[PDB]
Each structure stands twice: as structure tokens, then as C-alpha cells.
């Protein structure tokens, strides 16, 4: 049992999935062609004799990235009809991915997910990888999440995403897509993790001292985070973190389900020898504003619940010591209505190293997911960008052309402002 289904929507999701599946194949020992020369049941199936098929699905409205997968070294891993492909890209348009182009591919992905979930007896949740800016990763992810909610229901729906950066962004119509997708993410996703590309670049520049990091390094870090998330399902440890109890401990209110991922230690090879990577120091480094994986300052916010996913050579004693030291620190501030705000999971499997990766071999690793109030700042700045572009009605006709109304933008903005008001209300003490 303990099965999970991975969904990768858009280019960002497909490439992050390539990183994640290379990582899992390295972890469980499965060769790229699907043979091992137990614990893979969480992510891999069994087909006849010595075949491990990943429990994933690759959906994108343009063929380029999926055809990279179909021709790359992992072409034997997936069965051909698992990788789903449209004809025309959503073209950075929420409307195209949600109404016009996305409607001719949704039945096929839905029954593919149905058949993929029929093979597993202990399905726990879906991992949906997408981006908040692209037309596909916004619109089609919204459509898929609402169909999965009306179809599957009580199953958890974990969601990994690439939030647009405050400054360094690669799309012009990005805030529109982000607001439109969050208007449906607020209700159709049980726990949506936030990752920003700018923060990955900053982490790679400072810690991993890479002058020129590409998307493959970003996806490698994100894959490490997801592997740390699912290690409890895929391995054993002193304290196990199932997806359901993770969601229960991390989400205090139904609309507040946007925690911040962060991973530690992230270091270069040459920097690793001179560091005594103890549990206390990586636990401290998880709270460091420079090591945050989304460009927002936790100091301006107050934590509400943070889950600690230790893995490697970790004993609960020093975890308790580190948590106490954090509790004593005044810079890290917690809400008064959460006297205990740490969910702890210690695993036995150390984080593996992908060949050719930029991360050093480490005995211990921590993946913190803190549901802080600092994300209200990034959300409010995205709202400011949306308001600027919407006062002049710029780019709106590109959405009204194929299935949108002005009322959709107004509703999305009102819902997002309500979300900000909710975060402000839960921030203030009593």
C-alpha cells in the first residue's frame, strides 16, 4: 500500500518530474530501463517480470518536453500512453488551458489517473507538480484539481508549484494566471507547497556556489524536497510522516494550506568537509531567511506550524534539543494559539546524491515546511501587479477571446483579497 500518484502539468511540472524520477530511480536502485539488477511500491508498480513502472502522469498541451522524455534515457521507464500530449500549447493563457485547449485532453488524463489508481490498493494522495505562471500549469491544473475533487474527494491532494518571483520573472501575463489559478487552488487543494525560482537561484549562488545555475539545478533541489517529503512512505524511521497526518498537523484552517518548503543542508562538495553538519546547525539553518525557498522574510511574519522532516543519521534527542533552542530564540516568533508548533519525522535513509549533481554527500538532512504568515507579502505584491495590469485592462482580451469574462477576474481578485484578510486575522493574537 502507501501508494502515491504523481501528476506533472506543463513544462515546469514535466522537468521537475524528470528530476524527481531520476532521483527515485537512483534511490530505490531501479535502472532507467526499469529493472533492478519492497519499498518502491509507494511510487513504482510491477509489470510481469522485473519491471517498475512509475506511478506518474505527464500531461502537457505541447509535445516538446514530453517528446524529450519519450526520447531521453528514461524512455523505457514510462509506458507510452502514460505521457499525455496535446497539439497546441496553452500559450501562457489560463483561458486556453482551462476552457478551450484543455477540454480536449482532460477526459484522457482523468481515465488515465483512474486506471493508475485502480492498480494501487492503498492510495493516499496525489502529488501535482505545476507552475503558477504558465497557461497549462495554471488553467489545466485548476481543471484537473477540480475534477479530482469532484471524483476522488477525501484523498489528499498535495500540490507543488513554482510561485512567480517578486522581481525576476519570465512572463508578462504571469500575475493574471497566478490569481486565476489560486482562486481554485484555495478550495480544490488540501496542501499546496510554495517554491520560488529566485530563491532557488539565490540558494544555488550562496550555498552551492554555482555562478550559472540552470533549471536542472532548480529541479534537482525541488526533487530533493519532494523525496524528503515522501521518504516516510518509501522508507522507515523512528517517527514516520504520512501525508494525511502531515496535512493534519500543518494546516490549522481550511483556507490556510500554503506552507513554505525549505531544505538543509545544501552545500558544495568542498564546503562539506570543513562543516560539522550536526542536527542543531541544520535545524537552525532551516529557519534562516537566506535559506528560505520562497523570496519572503519570515521575520516580518509569525509561524503557525512547522513540520520537521529529518532523515539520515538522526536521533530524536538532538532534534528535541534543536527545537528547544529554536523555542528560546526571540527572532523566530510563533503565534500564541499554537503552544507546540513542531511536527517531527526522523527517517533512516540518508539523502542520496544524484551523479553529476551539485549537492555534497551528507549524513543528515532536514526538510522544513513552515506555514508562516510571511507569504502574505508575496501574495500582496502579486495582487499589486495584477491591479496595475488590470486597471488598464491590458491583455484581458486574450482571455475573453476563448472563454473568460471580466467577472472571473473580479471574482479572483475578491477571493484573493479575502485570503489576505484571513491571513491578517489569523496573524493577530488574542
Amino acid at each position: 500500500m502507501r501508494e502515491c500518484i504523481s501528476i506533472h502539468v506543463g513544462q515546469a511540472g514535466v522537468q521537475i518530474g524528470n528530476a524527481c524520477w531520476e532521483l527515485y530511480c537512483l534511490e530505490h536502485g531501479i535502472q532507467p530501463d526499469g529493472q533492478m539488477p519492497d519499498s518502491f511500491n509507494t511510487f513504482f508498480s510491477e509489470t510481469g517480470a522485473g519491471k517498475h513502472v512509475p506511478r506518474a502522469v505527464f500531461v502537457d498541451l505541447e509535445p516538446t518536453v514530453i517528446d524529450e522524455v519519450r526520447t531521453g534515457t528514461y524512455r523505457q521507464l514510462f509506458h507510452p500512453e502514460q505521457l499525455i500530449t496535446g497539439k497546441e500549447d496553452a500559450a501562457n493563457n489560463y483561458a486556453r488551458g482551462h476552457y478551450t485547449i484543455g477540454k480536449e485532453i482532460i477526459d484522457l488524463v482523468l481515465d488515465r489517473i483512474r486506471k493508475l489508481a485502480d492498480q494501487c490498493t492503498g492510495l493516499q494522495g496525489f502529488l501535482v507538480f505545476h507552475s503558477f505562471g504558465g497557461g497549462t500549469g495554471s488553467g489545466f491544473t485548476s481543471l484537473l484539481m477540480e475534477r479530482l475533487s469532484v471524483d476522488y474527494g477525501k484523498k489528499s491532494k498535495l500540490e507543488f508549484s513554482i510561485y512567480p518571483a517578486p522581481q525576476v520573472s519570465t512572463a508578462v501575463v504571469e500575475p493574471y494566471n497566478s490569481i486565476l489559478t489560486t482562486h481554485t487552488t484555495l478550495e480544490h487543494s488540501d496542501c499546496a507547497f510554495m517554491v520560488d525560482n529566485e530563491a532557488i537561484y539565490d540558494i544555488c549562488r550562496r550555498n552551492l556556489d554555482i555562478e550559472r545555475p540552470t533549471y536542472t539545478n532548480l529541479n534537482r533541489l525541488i526533487s530533493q524536497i519532494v523525496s524528503s517529503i515522501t521518504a516516510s512512505l518509501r522508507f522507515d524511521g523512528a517517527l514516520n510522516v504520512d501525508l494525511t497526518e502531515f496535512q493534519t498537523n500543518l494546516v490549522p484552517y481550511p483556507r490556510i494550506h500554503f506552507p513554505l518548503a525549505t531544505y538543509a543542508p545544501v552545500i558544495s562538495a568542498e564546503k562539506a568537509y570543513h562543516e560539522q553538519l550536526s542536527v542543531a546547525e541544520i535545524t537552525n539553518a532551516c529557519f534562516e531567511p537566506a535559506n528560505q525557498m520562497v523570496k519572503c522574510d519570515p521575520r516580518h511574519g509569525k509561524y503557525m506550524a512547522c513540520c520537521l522532516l529529518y532523515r539520515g543519521d538522526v536521533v530524536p534527542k538532538d532534534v528535541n534539543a534543536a527545537i528547544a533552542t529554536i523555542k528560546t530564540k526571540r527572532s523566530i516568533q510563533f503565534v500564541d494559539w499554537c503552544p507546540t508548533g513542531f511536527k517531527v519525522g526522523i527517517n533512516y535513509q540518508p539523502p542520496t546524491v544524484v551523479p553529476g549533481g551539485d549537492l555534497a554527500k551528507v549524513q543528515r538532512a532536514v526538510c522544513m515546511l513552515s506555514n508562516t504568515t510571511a507569504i502574505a507579502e508575496a501574495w500582496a505584491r502579486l495582487d499589486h501587479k495584477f491591479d496595475l495590469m488590470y486597471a488598464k485592462r491590458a491583455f484581458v482580451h486574450w482571455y475573453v477571446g476563448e472563454g473568460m469574462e471580466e467577472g472571473e477576474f473580479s471574482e479572483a481578485r475578491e477571493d484573493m483579497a479575502a485570503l489576505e484578510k484571513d491571513y491578517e486575522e489569523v496573524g493577530v493574537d488574542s
Binding site: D297, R299, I332
Partner: protein, 46 residues
């Protein structure tokens, strides 16, 4: 000689005034520039 130095001071004042006017006109719209990033310093707990 006093008249000559008074005229000298007046000339210097006029030159300074026109130079400042040109600087004010230039500063309204800077010229297009492009370089490297100069990343911001990371913030630390303090």
C-alpha cells in the same frame, strides 16, 4: 580692478547657473544602461 573682479564673479555665477540647468534637464530621464546584477545582501536574524 574691482569692476573686473565683479564681472568675473558674475560670469562664474552665470556659468554655474547654466551648468546646473543642463544637469537638471539631463537628470529628468537617465540614459539607457545595462550591466551585471549587483545582488542584494542576504538578510540575517539579528
Amino acid at each position: 580692478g574691482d569692476q573686473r573682479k565683479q564681472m568675473l564673479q558674475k560670469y562664474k555665477e552665470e556659468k554655474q547657473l547654466q551648468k546646473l540647468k543642463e544637469q537638471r534637464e539631463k537628470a529628468k530621464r537617465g540614459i539607457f544602461k545595462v550591466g551585471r546584477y549587483r545582488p542584494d545582501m542576504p538578510c540575517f536574524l539579528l
